[PDB]
Every structure is written in structure tokens, then in C-alpha cells.
Symmetry: D2
Subunit: 503 residues, 4 copies
């Protein structure tokens, strides 16, 4: 393919073969067993780019005890909001001081284009900064009007020990969307990144240490899903599990956590529509459609995976979309020109292709792609577009998590809302229209937590994120995330004595 | 042994003659179960008197109620009405509650075994819960962010959760329905309310009041029956968006587990083992009254009960003396008597469970100072006011929720010890601190891990403030402005006015 | 000329028989001025009909009212009541407003010259204002700061400002009282209400309804009289904490300067020159109706009037044709007729001033398309619906607030031009944008410097949202949650539990 | 008096004069006329330590014009919250980087002990940091429940151009309590510091320039009260005046501002009481009373200028207070050991002594101090009166010197009535270990800035301002942003409304 950029396994940066340790109670540690996991660069076949411990259940429980002691006995929850804030600002500063190093790690472990990784690192420094600024102003309420003899207080307090589990598609970003709100709320944390992508999360805990946030406030453990996931969800000393990843894994940890009334925060998958009306800015919308589906090679929960297009502009929109799709640079994650990088693993690329196969067998019309590219060099899947998709097809309903767009048409705004909502998911949606009523009413009527008008993907630390329906529980970011990691205590204070019950 | 503060029930009372029959309310219609099967409620206060009958719903009966709520949410006017419109209808329900206060109070008394004077006050409180919620429902807001770039506007829109299943317990039927329903429907939600098999009368009447007020069909449905199938159905049905459960930790955890299978939102309000901490500098007469109130309110069948007394050494004797004086005199017994302050146990199984905890406390070596037996066995279900002393944290009576009129007393020396003892529980619903000292009262209350706290008071709260638990006592916050967030979804919208900068470049 | 849309006053209407003598209300008592002097109101719709009389207060009469509010606040129970207690009393007032709706609507119609159907809708809206405020009054909060050191607790307490003097205009007497009084007394304040010399009847009735509801003596007092002495007394008296004035910029600025002499808080809601901007892509029929409504509502005697039409060149003729068709047909005249949409000028002095502006517009070279004279001169005070075209922004009719049914039309080519024209005013009260385009509707409204904005609508607002002006149109915000902050003080408390670190070593 | 630290005439830092210029539209400039004003350092022999321009009315109008253009046409208000915030954090960093330079200027110009000044500058860096964090999170409301065809928006916008006038007693702190909340809201500013104490304010504007804040966002002009005061209150291009200083000057500016409906924020004087109950921590309270009245030599609006003591701890308290009063190092502002600095001017030092003599002739009991001290420097001895009664001038009027008025009370109810018998309502402290006494007494005092078992020390997190004649509006915390914002209510109809004409 003309737009494919082949990698160069001779890149000097591939010779750095970083080895990492877990960080538990301030100390960098191996697994008791000494076992390790290697990460092979998905963009560069056979090139080992990271190794970290494979934790046992007991290794993870030690991380929990460190977080527990840090919360029960340590200074962190006792400090002022301002003191907590100053330390978190130092982490934000260190993230920028190490931007190049951190972006390289993400690119190599995830297969993320390096330019995209570099931008994500800077956005993470901004997340830490936002949260640091808000951490000191966290408040509760006074009720000075419940009777002269009484005063009502609602006090904000930390939930306690939070286990945070993060996925392979946006490792650093997801840690930075969770950890700062949790510890900023006065919580202590055990972070468990994906077995594929633990490098930047270990570095992040090491930066917090260098900052230096007290021992055991921010711990990181590494390993496969099974030990760590079960442990954090059932350990008595963990007060909350904040999970980000698939519905399948989310619901399992959710069921486990419910056994002991553990608070649960879930950010899960979706099948996000972009609705393009006939009066949209056609060039802006076409570019947004491509961005929505190809960003992170479509390995994105807020991907625009369904394109719902009004009948009258379907042809003009498809033409512009295919043109972008044929020209957009994909391949080598280390090339500064690359816009779309590698699939995370062979099993995942296989999953994506199997949906492309089901699409074809369903009768949907393949317009572009639908095959692996540069198979010898690494894991790459072609930009893929289906037309003629109907709502019943498995490709219109299930989350593919690859660069695969399903196109459906509609005639009226009412039909478009009905199609957008005919999903068990409810994470994201975009509406493209220049019409005040169409844009606002459509967005108001779609059951999705993360919405956009005349845009896609790009958000701000200032606004809350989360899903409706099966795409999640709770709300992160903005001021909302602090409520996720806080308990609220209602206090009825009687000054003097109450009226007696026994007369 | 007969106690002179026991008010014997009168089998003769005319109010027992009325054998009230009730129907479910689904999509505006009063309906029997498909099967025609019913459950009777015998008054716990008055042996053998049936005082209520209602349908035994099947799973399909419940799914039909879910379907009605689903339709009212997806196609009906309720979530598309203005907050003001919803608010006016909810005020009309509040006014109807007041209008029917004596009728409602009598039902609650007969079905729960609640003293009639307490039930009367509760019904008044419920009208107030409805009024508070109605006034707040129209003011519910989200946020604008007008500072995220000239080309962009940030919106956070508040919307309803959708269809909410609400399961309420036997101890405060009308109150808990009034703490949940108005916040859920005020947020634009529609509801299927499932009250306890023992105590469905006032909850059916509440749904009939909403219909009488003009609330659209399917917004507020009520089904009746045993714990299951309703519990399972609400937790598993794909058309239910959220389950709001109030009851035991045991049942709550199980419904939570089921609900998690489909990523269902869950609100839980569960049991506790609430401590009241009395310092040496407390107002002794007020504290002693508060201790009695704390444990005997609702016959101790109360999630926020003061079931543990933690008393500073050496006000111990002076507090105990006052507590025992009150406990000897306080009127318990016949729910229909206006003088009764403490009523009946909900059921024979429950009364045996309470007595089993008492016997366990004895075998543990705790000192029984008062009570510890059934009273008027032939007349109804009554348990004497009971006080244990010399309880140590390891005993089952110090740890487990008894849910009877049974106090466990433990002493401490220092504030720090009081805090450690208070937090030495898997529960965290409620706590009270009694002290005249600024630093002790406030630092102690700040350090206790419980969601519902009191200083120099106990039990009585306000619609204005949030309620909920820490640890195993609950998930989420109800009441005040908080309850509306429990029944809302928040939608974050990034609005580009014009066009974004192109990605392909 | 006789217009066929003019409804001539019917002097045989039996409602014109009603004579009404009102008294001031101070410290719970209905009272005359010490002098016995009174002021009559002649109906502006019906020549020679005397429809109300009320006292002409002396400076000393007003100080007595101030002293009653002072006593009510300093010693009486109102500010010490719970929010819930105040709320219940305010809901009773809202209920009374509805119970007396027809009575109140008639008073407003007769005294103001307001069409009876409009007056009736306003009274209903006022009942909703009182209900909204009553709902919110009980939930008012401050903040806790639990994160400023383990040894400290931060509290922000909300408290009432105290005694508030409220001065209201003749154009919307009941509405403005109802947008101010409930927010003030709901905050725990006590008030002295001073309505216009022309229109005191509904305001005295409102104070009488508060008394009837059981609001404590001295919480809500009303005095009547000319602009001064009342205005000067309220703005200079040491026992007044705040003046909330609504009326002309000239009077507000003067009261503002006087009040500043003693650091007295001031809320001002003043006049405007509000534009409606109609873009080529607007819904033309809707925009045309909204233009008519914007300028003719209350006979244009309205601070939020759309007194300037800024219309995009391409649709100027189509919009004008629709606007003039409505303007030829719309019923104006007899305020007592149910068909009337536009009523009387408030006074002969006001009608002359309105005509003075129209004559100035003609001399400036503006094109008179419609109206521009008095109608039914013998029967009452009526001014014809009036439209000017070809208005340029240097003309006195583009710049000054006319306060009659007189529209000034100017054209523009681009949104940027429309914004600059809209903002080329010293005023900043209201503005409307009509457009079907997302970007131009929202970007235009974000760029216009006015506090009360509308898209694709005009005039009609909600109690839920705040109101007030930019620039010379006002100071402060009323309504929604904002009005409570206007009548509250916030007390920041740094609480040290135990001992701070010593300053002296 | 052996607690006096005599000023060292030879300290070299007294010889290092500094000259400053105004800063307008990013440019450092002298007055059009070239005229300047000097400042003599009040703790020392007539040593000139600062000079800055004497502005004309036209100079101030140009500063307003620069702010106006910066707001109407420049990037500042159109920037995201995040972008403004990043620039404000850079100013916070610069303040810390220049801490010692700034502390010395404040010490030299106002007569403030250098250890106090050091802490103050540190605190100002924190004020800027807090404000910078909060600026990006400012929000309005959506009302999504006012009918299916409608959407309510409340949009927060900047008020526009703000004139900020600051006093001689805390020049850097008050600039740092106002400017960051104003520019953080999207506003542009013209700062006018006192003629006595312009040095740190000019440096602050230059730090903002150095940080990269756009030209015209933060301007600083210097000179006497007028013409700057009049111009800021009268210029139609100014949208708001934020004034801090005396009731007398505040009320006059407020009157002028009212003539054109100009928004005004006022932070004025006080007569703050500290209430000490019999159950208070005696040692902490005694130390608190001394702090309260002697901080900044009593030249403080939040001074505990009245002591209200419960009969029966009166004598044990008075003993502790006098012991402290006699040992506390006062004098040379340049000494690291000094706790109490110099008076501001000769005219002010004399005003303080005049109140002291008027307190003597009223019948009050002088227990300590009451004398001017020095020949080279303006100073006043720690002064404690007993037996003061509500009606005496020293009980009613703001002295603004290190002069305590002591009154006794029997009950909490009398303590409250005594605390509230003032036209002021800026601050109050309550000392008690009793839950009900501490909280009910604080709830009943009509004052905006309150303390329990503490005095003086506050946080950026919490709002400040006065009741009664002590001010209008609320600064700091989240409240200060509302002071510099306008709120725009929008009823948005999607599609079309129901027609009026049917
Ligand atoms: Ca007549």
C-alpha cells in the first residue's frame, strides 16, 4: 500500500532494552518468584522493548498493605489539600521534564505513533496539573438554617485504598485520568497496568517517588490479568476498584467486588456513532469520521465505530472519506509522519480480522482495507471501511476495537437517534450539523455520556467523562472524579442539648 | 415476668376488625397477581389478627411492572416534562399524604407494629420528604464551561438514570419509600417499588396517591410479594437501569452481585452497628435520654440504631443509672396505644433471632443488666428493653447487627481509644458523639468512619442533608441534593461551533 | 384616525364601580399615614375612574416601617427559624396568590392599564415565583473545608443581609415584588416594600397575604407614597442594610450614590435598549411574531423590551411585511376586555414623553411605517403600535429608552456587524438572537454584552434562571439560586481545634 | 524600653535606592510630565528608598485604554482557562524566585519587619498559585429541565476592565488577593498602589510581563489619590473599581462610581473584637491577643483592636498579655528578630497617639505603652488600655496602631451584644473550649472574617470580606471569581416558541 510506512528494526532506540521493577511502599522490587514478562514491540517484530515482574497474589497483597498503612497511619490523608497539591504539581513538572523518554516508552510498548505519544504525554502533564489545582479546593457543605440549636455539616473525606486497573490502549493517559483524582482526594493507590504496557506506569510511580509523595501512597504492580484483578477485587483492605477495559472483564470484577460491598468505578467499551446530517460542514465531517475511527488504530473506547449518514450526503461524504483513508500515513510508530500505528498483539489483530470476515459474510460491502499489512515487519491492519451495513449485523453492534468503520444511512433526525441508541453501549457519540435544533436536540436524545458536536475524540480535563448503559459506572475527571474517590459524611450537630425523647 | 411499663394490647380494638385488602399498581391500573395468589399480614402487636392482604407477584407480574416503567420512560410524558411540572405533581402527593395522615399512620402501625404516635409523626415527616424533593427537583442543574476556547463550549447536561427498581424494608416502609421515590421520579426517572412482604399497605397507598395526584401511568408502579422473584427480576431485567436496595448486608450483597453482571447501577443502604460515644464532659441527662432513644427507637429495628454504647470510664456509673431509670419506665407494647413509645417485633422468626443474640451475649460472659426476654407471649410479639454491660469487642453482640432493643455497653479511657473501638467494625452507617468540648466533639466525629453522624443528638435528621454509609453499610448517597445525583446520568458535551482543525493535514 | 384593532373602553363595565382604599402595613398592622394624607390612582385605561387610594407616607412613616423590619430581624423569630419553617409560610403565600388570582389580576389591570388576560397570567407566574423561592429557601448552603490541616476546619456560613428596602416600578408591580421579596425573606431578611405611587394595590395585598399566611409581624412591611421621601429614607437610614431598586437609570444612579455614602449594599435592575437580531436563516413567521411580542408586550413599557430590531439585509422586506400584518391586527385598548393584547400608557406625562421620542424620530429622518399618535384621547391613555424603519445608530430613537410601543429598525449584513450594533449602547439588560444556525446563534449570544439573553424567543423566562444587566442596566443578579446570594452575607470561619502555634517564642 | 531594637543607621541596604516606572500596555514608562514622588523609609533616618511617577489623569486614561484594548481586541479573554492558568503559575514561580528582593522592598517602604515581609511574599506566591488552579475550573450552569423545546444556559464571562486601588499597609498581599482573581476571570486590570508603597506592585506587574502575560492585561500606574482614583471611578472604559483602604475614601469612590452604575468592590476598615471565655486555653489566647493587636503594628483592618474578656479570667489573661507585651521585640524593620515594625507616616503615628491621649481623658486605664519612641524613625510602644466602656472613642473608632481596648463581660449574650455594638463588621475571634459557646457565639457575631481559637492567619481557600460598613463583596476562594464575573442567563428555544399573536 502506497500510504504504508515500513518500520526500521535497525533504529537505535530499539537497542535500549529497558528493564523495570514494581514500586511498593517506596521501594523498587522484583516479584518474590523473580519471574518476569517481556514486551515485544508490536510495530517491530521480535524486538523486546520492556520487561517487568510477573507478580504473584502475595506480591499484590503487599502492595495493598503498603497503601493501607499509608492511608491509616501515614501523613498523606492528614496533609492539607494545599500540601497534597504542591507534590502533585511536582509530578506534572517531572512528566514534562521527561516527555521524550516517556513518549518513546508508550510508542514502543503500545505501537502508538510517536507524534501521537508525545502529545499524549503533554496532555497527561496537564491532567496532573488540573487535578493538582482542584485538589486543594475540594469542599463539602454547611447548613446554617436547620434550626437555631443545630448546625448541619457535610464533610468530604477520602474513600481510602483504591485499586486502579488500566488497559493497554492508553496506559499513561488512563493512569493520569485516575491516579491524580484518587490521591488528590486523599486516597492511597495500587495501580495495575496491562501486562503489555507497564513501562510508563512504573515510571509514573517513580516520578511520584522522586516528587516525593510519601511511601505507599502510589504503588504499582505488574503481571497478568488473573492474579492482580481477582486480588484487588476481593482483598478486604481495598475500599474501591477503578477498572478501565472491556465489558467482559469489567462485569466480572464488578460481580466479585459486590460480594464485599466494595465501591466500583468502571470505564468500559462502546460502539460510538458519529451522526452526519446533510447540512454539516462536509470537509470537516469527513476528516472527523476518519479521525474518529483511525485514532489509535481504532483501539479506543470512544472510537467513532459507526458512521450514521443522512441519505443526501452519503455519496459526497463517502468520497471524501475514502480519499483521506487512502492517503493517511500508517505503519512505523517511530516515524514522525505516522498517523496510525500498530495493533497491540497478534490475538487482538486476529479478533479485528474476524469481525471484518463476519462483515463480508453478512453482506456488507467492503470498500477499503480488510487485511493485514507488512506482516513480516510487525502488527499492522489496513484502514477498513464497510458500506451497506444494517443494524442487526454483528459489525454494527459489537466493539471491533480496530480501524474498521461500519456505515449506515438514515433519512430523518428521529431515525438517527433511534439507530444511535440501538446498542447496549453508551460511552460516546458525535453529531455533525450546522443547525442549532438538529445538533442540540440530537445530542440531548442520545444516551451516551461523552458527546461531541462538530468534533470527535478531543476533550478537556475540565469536563467529566463516563458511560451510560453497559459502557460504565461513575464519572471521572473535572470536579466529578473527586466525588468518585470521596466519601461524604452528613453531620447533624446539636449545640447544647436536644429535646428529650423520654417525657 | 410481667413488667409494669408493658402496655397490654387490646384484642377488642375496632381498628383490627377491618381486614384491608390491597392490589398492585401497574401502568395506572390496580391489579392482582396473574395467579390470584395473596399474602396475609398478621399484626405483630395483636396475635392472630389479619390486618392486610396483597398479591404474591410472580416473576412475569414484575416484568410487566418493569415494562410499564420502561414505556413511561421511553414514550411517556414524564421525563419530557419540565422540572416545574414534575414538581407540582409531587407537591400534590405531599398534600395528599397530609390529607390521609391518620389513615396512613394506622396502616403503618398495624403492619409494622410501630407505636401509633411514632407512625403519625413518620407520615408527617414523609409529606415533608416529598415537599423537600418536589422543591429541589425543578432546580436540578448541570454546568457550562465557557472558558475552553472561543471556538468551543462545554456543557454538562443532567438527565435521568431511567427505570429504577426500588426495594424497601419492613422497618420503615413509608419513610424509605419517601426517601427514594421522590428523588428518583423528581430526577425524571420511572420506578417499580417493591416493599416488604410484611408491610406493603402504605406503599400501595402511596402509589395510589400519585395516581390520584395525576402522575402519568407507569411512572410509579408497585409490586408485592416475597423477596424473590421480585429481587432477582429487578436485578437482572435488561429494562431496569438501576436497583436501589435498602435492607440487610446479606441480601444487598447478593443483589449487587447479580446487578453487576449487566453493569446495572446499584444504590445500597444497609445495616450497621452504630456506636454512641459519651465523654465525661457530656450533658449527662441529655446523653442518657439519647442512649435510650438511640437503642429503643423502633424497638431497635433500625439501621441507624445506637446499638453500642462507648462510655468514658467514670461517667459510666452515673450514665448507666440514668439510662436504667428511663428504661424501667418507658412505655412499650400495644402499638395502638397513644402512650406507647416502643412497639412490637416484626415477626416470630425475628424475635427468636434477637433472643438468640441475647443468649449468645450471656454465654459470652456479658453482664445482663435489664430485660433479655419476650413479654406478653400470648398477646403478640414483644421483646423487653435489654441492656448488657462489660461487652468486649470480640463478642458476637459487640460485632453483629441484632436489630432488637438490645444495647451493648463498653468503656474507654481516651478519645483515641473511643475512635479505635468505634471503627472496629465492618459497618459504617451511623455514629453519635456526646461532648460539650469543641475539640473532642469535632475531632472525634471527623475520625469516625460512618456516613450518618450526630453530635449531642441521635436518630433525628433532615431531608436537607445526605444519608448513606461507609464500608459495608452502603453504596451511594440519598436525600438532600445528593439523592438526585444518584438517579441522574451526566452527559459531557464538547461543542465545536464551526469546525475543528483538521486531523488529516 | 380610528384603528379597527382599537378596543374602546366600555365605561359600563361593572368592575369600574369598585372603589378601593388601601392602608400601609407596618409591624403587622394596617395603618394610615400619620397625616392622613392619601394619593389617588385614576385608571389609565378609563378616563376619570378612581381605582385606588393609599397613604402618602411621610419620612417618619417610612422610618417606622424600617424600625419594624429592624425589630423583626434583630429580636423576632423569622431569621432564627429553619429554612423549612420559612418555606412552609412562603408556600402558604403562593397558595393564597392562586386563591386570590382573579381579584389580584383585576387590581393590576385597573391600576397599571395592563390587559386583564396578561395580568391574570402574571399573577399565576407570581405564584410560581413564590413557590420556586419557597422550595429553594430551605436548601441554601455554605461550604466546609475539611482539608486545611488536621488541626483546623474551615466553615463558610450563609446568613441573611438583614433589613432590605425594596423599591418597585409601575410597569410590573406584582411581578417585581415577587422576584425580590421571596428571595430576600427566604434568605432570612426582613423587608420594607415601596411600590410606585401609581400602582400600590397589588403590593399592599401581597403584604396582607403574607400576614394572612402567618408570616411574623415586621418581616414584610409595605409603605406607599411619592418617590421621595421613601426613596431617600431607604437609601440613607442607618437601620437599612440594603436597597434593592428597580426602575430608571436616572433614579437608580441617584439612589446608588446616596447608598454609597454609608456603604449600604445596592441591587439595581434598570432600563435597557434591547436588540432582537434576526438572521436571514431565521424561522421568519416565528421571528416576526417574536418581534411584535418583544416591542408591544406591556405596551413597550418594559425594561427587557425588544425596542431595536437589527435585521439581516436579505430578509428585511419579508420580515417587515409579516411584522406589519401582525401590527395592523393586534388588539389594543380596553384593559378590561379579554381580547385586548396591548393596554394603556401609565400616565399622561409618560404618553407625552413617548410621543416626544416619536416626533424626534421623524425629525431625525427615520421612516414612520405605522402608528406614531395617541388613540382614543377622550376615553383613556393609549398610544398606537409604532414602527420606524431606516434608523441609524446616532439617532436618539436608536439610543434612548422610549418605554412605549415604538420599534426602531436597523439592517446589517454580517454577524460581526450585528454584534457591534447590538453592543453600541450604554445599556446591557436583554437581547434576542433569531437563527437556525448553531454557530451564529450561540456565537452571537456569547458576544452580546447583556445579562438576559434569548435565542429564538423573547420576554418569556423562568424562575430557575438568574436575571440582571451588564453595563448601566443593573448591579447584581436576581432569581434562581443567584437572588439568594444577593440577600445573603457569607461568613468565613477558620476554626482551630485546640491551640494554634504560638506567635511569641 | 529594653524590648526595643534601635534602628541601625548604617545598615547598607538603606543606601541602595530603587527607582520604578509605571507599566502600561507592556511598556515601562514615566509620567508624560516626568514628575516623580519619593518614599522615605519610615523606620529610619530620612533615607529615600523608592521613587515612582506622579501620573496625570491622561496617563491613567492611557492605562485604562490599554486594558480596554487588551479586553476588547486582545487574546487574554479569548484564551482558555488553562492557558491563563499556566501564565499565572509562572508569576507564582517568579514571586518565589524573587522572594528576598520583594521582602526587602516591602520592609523598606511600609516599615514592616523583614521576617514578616518574607512570610507575606511567600503567602502571595500561594495566593497566585491557588487562583491559577481555580481559574481554569470556573463554570456556569445548564438547565436541561425547562421544557423539551428549550435549554437554559448560564454563562460565566469576565466583567471586563477592573481598576484596583490598594492601601499602604499590605501592598503586595492585597494586589495578590485581587489581581489574580480578576485576570483569572478573563478581566484586564489597572492597578493603583498607594503613593507610599508602589515598589512591590510595579515589580508584580513586571513579573507578569516576564511570565508572558499579554500586553495591557496587567497595567500599573502610580501617584497620589487623585487624579488616579477619580479617573478609575469616572472613566466609562472602566467596568469595575475594587478598592481597599479606609471607609472615608471607600465611601467617596463608591459615590462617584454609582453615578455611572459602575460595579464596586470595597474592603474597608474594622474594629475587630476577640472574645475570650473563662474556659479558653489561657496561654494560647493570651498569645493570640498580642498577635491580634500587634501584627503589622496594629495597622491592620482585621486587627483584634477590642479585647472582650469574661470576668474571672480577666486577671490571669491580663497578666499573661502584659508579660508578652513587655518582652516582644519591636523596632528596626531590618532586624530578623523584630516582631513589630514602624508606623507608616508622621501624620499616622500622631493619629495613633492622639487616640491614646483621648482614651486617657475619657477615663480609661493605661496599663502599658502610650508613648512615641525614637530620634531617627517613627515608632509606637505596645499599648494596652483597661476599663474601656462602649461609648469611648477608643472603643468605637479604628486606631490602626498597636493599641488594645479591653472591656469585660459576664455572659455569652453580653459578649455578643458588645461585639456587635459597632458600625464595622470585618473580623472577630472567639476563644473557648466549649462547643456550644464557640460556635453559637461565632454564628451570632455580624462579621465576615471569623476565627475560633485563632486570629489573623487565613487561607486562600476561604472567602474574605466585611459586614456593615467594613465592605461590599467577597474576595478569595471561589468567591473572588464571582466578584470579577458577569453571569448571562440564556433561554434557548430549539425550533420555535408558541406564537404570541394567535
Ligand atoms: Ca368608578
Amino acid at each position: 500500500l502506497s500510504n504504508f510506512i515500513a518500520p526500521d528494526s535497525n533504529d537505535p532506540r530499539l537497542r535500549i532494552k529497558s528493564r523495570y521493577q514494581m514500586l511498593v511502599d517506596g521501594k523498587s522490587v522484583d516479584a518474590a518468584s523473580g519471574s518476569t514478562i517481556d514486551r515485544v514491540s508490536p510495530g517491530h517484530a521480535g524486538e523486546v522493548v520492556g520487561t517487568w515482574p510477573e507478580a504473584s497474589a502475595d506480591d499484590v497483597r503487599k502492595a495493598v498493605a503498603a497503601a493501607r498503612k499509608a492511608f491509616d497511619a501515614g501523613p498523606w490523608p492528614r496533609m492539607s489539600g494545599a500540601e497534597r497539591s504542591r507534590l502533585m504539581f511536582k509530578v506534572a513538572d517531572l512528566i514534562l521534564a521527561r516527555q521524550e523518554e516517556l513518549a518513546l516508552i508508550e510508542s514502543l510498548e503500545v505501537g502508538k505513533p510517536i507524534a501521537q505519544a508525545r502529545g499524549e504525554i503533554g496532555f497527561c502533564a496537564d491532567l496532573w496539573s488540573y487535578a493538582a489545582g482542584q485538589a486543594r479546593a475540594l469542599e463539602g457543605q454547611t447548613h446554617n438554617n436547620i434550626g437555631d440549636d443545630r448546625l448541619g455539616l457535610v464533610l468530604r473525606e477520602p474513600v481510602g485504598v483504591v485499586g486502579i486497573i488500566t488497559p493497554w490502549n492508553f496506559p499513561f493517559i488512563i493512569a493520569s485520568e485516575r491516579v491524580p483524582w484518587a490521591i488528590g482526594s486523599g486516597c492511597t493507590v495500587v495501580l495495575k497496568p496491562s501486562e503489555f504496557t507497564s513501562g510508563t506506569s512504573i515510571r509514573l510511580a517513580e516520578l511520584a517517588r522522586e516528587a516525593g509523595i510519601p511511601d505507599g501512597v502510589f504503588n504499582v504492580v505488574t503481571g497478568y490479568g488473573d492474579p492482580a484483578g481477582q486480588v484487588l477485587a476481593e482483598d478486604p483492605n481495598v475500599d474501591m476498584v477503578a477498572f478501565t477495559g472491556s465489558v467482559r472483564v469489567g462485569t466480572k470484577l464488578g460481580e466479585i467486588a459486590a460480594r464485599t460491598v466494595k465501591r466500583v468505578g468502571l470505564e468500559l467499551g462502546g460502539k460510538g456513532p458519529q451522526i452526519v446530517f446533510a447540512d454539516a460542514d462536509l470537509d470537516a465531517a469527513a476528516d472527523g469520521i476518519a479521525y474518529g475511527v483511525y485514532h489509535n488504530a481504532g483501539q479506543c473506547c470512544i472510537s467513532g465505530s459507526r458512521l450514521l449518514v443522512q441519505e443526501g450526503i452519503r455519496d459526497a461524504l463517502m468520497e471524501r472519506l475514502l480519499d483521506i483513508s487512502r492517503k493517511v500515513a500508517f505503519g512505523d510508530p517511530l516515524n514522525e509522519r505516522t498517523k496510525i500505528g500498530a495493533m497491540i498483539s497478534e490475538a487482538h489483530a486476529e479478533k479485528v480480522h474476524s469481525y471484518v470476515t463476519a462483515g463480508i459474510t453478512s453482506g456488507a460491502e467492503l470498500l477499503l482495507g480488510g487485511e493485514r499489512i507488512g506482516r513480516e515487519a510487525g502488527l499492522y491492519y489496513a484502514p477498513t471501511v464497510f458500506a451497506g451495513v444494517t443494524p442487526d449485523m454483528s459489525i454494527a453492534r459489537e466493539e471491533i476495537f480496530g480501524p474498521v468503520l461500519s456505515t449506515l444511512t438514515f433519512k430523518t433526525a428521529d431515525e438517527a437517534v433511534a439507530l444511535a441508541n440501538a446498542t447496549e453501549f453508551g460511552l460516546s457519540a458525535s453529531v455533525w450539523s450546522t443547525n442549532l435544533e438538529t445538533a442540540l436536540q440530537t445530542i440531548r436524545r442520545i444516551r451516551a455520556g461523552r458527546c461531541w458536536i462538530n468534533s470527535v475524540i478531543d476533550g478537556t480535563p475540565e469536563l467529566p467523562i463516563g458511560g451510560y448503559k453497559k459502557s460504565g459506572l461513575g464519572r471521572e475527571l473535572g470536579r466529578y472524579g473527586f466525588d468518585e474517590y470521596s466519601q461524604f459524611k452528613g453531620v447533624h450537630v446539636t449545640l447544647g442539648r436536644p429535646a428529650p425523647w423520654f417525657t
